[PDB]
Amino acid sequence: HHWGYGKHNGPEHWHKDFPIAKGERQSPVDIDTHTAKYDPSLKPLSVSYDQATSLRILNNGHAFNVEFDDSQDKAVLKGGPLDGTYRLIQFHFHWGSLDGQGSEHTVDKKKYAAELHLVHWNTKYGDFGKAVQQPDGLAVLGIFLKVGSAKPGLQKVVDVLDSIKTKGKSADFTNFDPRGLLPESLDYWTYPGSLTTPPLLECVTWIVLKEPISVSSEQVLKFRKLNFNGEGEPEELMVDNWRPAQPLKNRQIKASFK
């Protein structure tokens, strides 16, 4: 009976195994754009993805991760609100059963169809596993998806999904360029928070871009054809794998723009 997204093991249940679920800096949150403070000391975000080396794509039973070689400084996030250098390890998405929901963060209570998470770890901690045990260990860049025009740079990901339909399947996934998933503007909001899945560790500086990317109806339909279950178990479509907004508690959201 492990965690998941259903009535009996979904987000309302997580605090039983992972008590920090009710902690002081949980994610996601609703971004109240009128209450977010413009911070003219915030730097432009530096996204340096020119040398990213993707390796593999994996269905883990919750989402699918595109994993990268993070054994060298190749795909790094820095500046913005960050001190130092954070290395890209994987990206994944959260999405809905319908285009009206699917994002984890919301903007003035608006849900988007999906949300992309590019996960990076602080190089001062030497690796991902050590980084998640630190309050400034990860920087996750979050990008909203709306449905409209296709995102050409996403198609390579959509086309490999039928090869990892069920939990525990993986495939070869080399030479994927994550620059193709970025909107034009790097204007962002930022706040201190957590992983949005168990173990829910409070180790994340969240950087959420204001500008969503457009993906087609066909592209997000292919996400919804994935499965939560393993091969040869009853089919449970992989949809609605998002945690809802959590209390802001004692925190400020900063804006990099007016």
Ligand SMILES: COc1ncnc(NCCc2ccc(S(N)(=O)=O)cc2)c1[N+](=O)[O-]
């Ligand atoms: C012991 O090490 C680990 N310790 C904690 N969590 C781990 N896996 C969670 C990683 C994760 C990354 C990002 C997000 S989100 N949705 O907030 O972007 C959620 C979970 C691992 N690990 O399996 O390596």
Ligand SMILES: [Zn+2]
């Ligand atoms: Zn995520």
